[PDB]
Design goal:
With 263 residues, this protein is of the alpha/beta class. It has helices at 68-80, 93-102, 133-145, 147-159, 166-176, 180-191, 219-228, 245-248, 250-261, and strands at 8-11, 15-20, 41-45, 86-91, 109-115, 206-213, 233-241. This is AB hydrolase-1 domain-containing protein.
Length: 263
């Protein structure tokens, strides 16, 4: 592999840091953040399977029907790279994927930093995730009725900000580039996932980073992960709007992510 996930390892720093991305983008979501990590950290970047920068020959609809397929990829990349010990930074579902990987090898991860991560988008009894199943059905029907019109309305809500903003236009490009059946299946694997039962067995320290205004992750989800993760945790709410604040507001995320990387 490595070439299969477009693994790039840049930097000269002492500490290893792995950067993961969420649905609809790729490792270029960190493009504004990387140059501020190279001096103090050795940065490891990779693309999730199914992304627009990825060959559909390697995407298995059965392997990625659960988030275990994404966690096995992460553990397989760290094995090939001979990673003994690193900090893992995970955006959106990749933050939960990093927690799922720490269940199998907790000694690899000294620290987990989650950005806009949620263990479950579905509401439930005494759990506010944000979405009802009829909200999911309409998003799954609209995604299959007109995939391009769905992207045009999903990207400004996901990133926040204006439709003429550069970040919204770039996320829309990367999201549109996912093959529509692959995008439909991955969106079903992600929006219907429920990782609340694995949280108390996570023993890796997690720094829970969250935007104050995130439409896919309510602010109370950051507090749920604060009490339910079994390892030592801390929460920092970012003064940003949107689910991809490292893309649309990098100048705010850089100092906060840097302080949590060293603390």
């Amino acid at each position: 592999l490595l070439d299969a996930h477009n693994v790039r390892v840049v930097g000269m720093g002492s500490e290893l840091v792995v950067l993961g991305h969420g649905f609809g983008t790729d490792q270029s979501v960190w493009k504004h953040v990387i140059p501020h990590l190279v001096d103090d950290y050795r940065v490891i970047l990779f693309d999730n399977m199914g992304a627009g920068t990825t060959d559909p020959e390697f995407f298995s609809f059965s392997r990625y029907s659960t988030l275990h397929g994404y966690a096995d990829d992460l553990l397989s990349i760290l094995e090939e790279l001979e990673v003994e010990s690193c900090i893992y930074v995970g955006h959106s579902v990749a933050g939960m994927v990093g927690c799922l990987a720490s269940l199998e090898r907790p000694e690899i991860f000294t620290k987990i930093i989650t950005l806009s991560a949620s263990p479950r988008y579905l509401n439930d009894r005494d759990y506010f995730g944000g979405f009802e199943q009829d909200d999911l059905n309409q998003l799954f029907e609209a995604m299959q009725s007109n995939f391009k019109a769905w992207v045009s309305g999903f990207a400004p809500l996901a990133v926040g900000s204006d439709i003429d903003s550069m970040a919204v236009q770039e996320f829309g490009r990367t999201l549109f580039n996912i093959r529509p059946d692959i995008a439909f299946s991955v969106a079903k694997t992600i929006f219907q996932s429920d990782l609340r039962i694995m949280l108390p067995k996570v023993t890796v320290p997690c720094h829970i980073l969250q935007s104050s205004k995130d439409l896919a992750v309510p602010l109370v989800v950051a507090d749920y992960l604060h009490h339910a993760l079994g390892g030592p945790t801390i929460v920092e709410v970012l003064p940003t709007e949107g689910h991809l604040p490292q893309l649309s507001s990098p100048d705010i995320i850089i100092p906060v992510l840097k302080r949590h990387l060293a603390g």
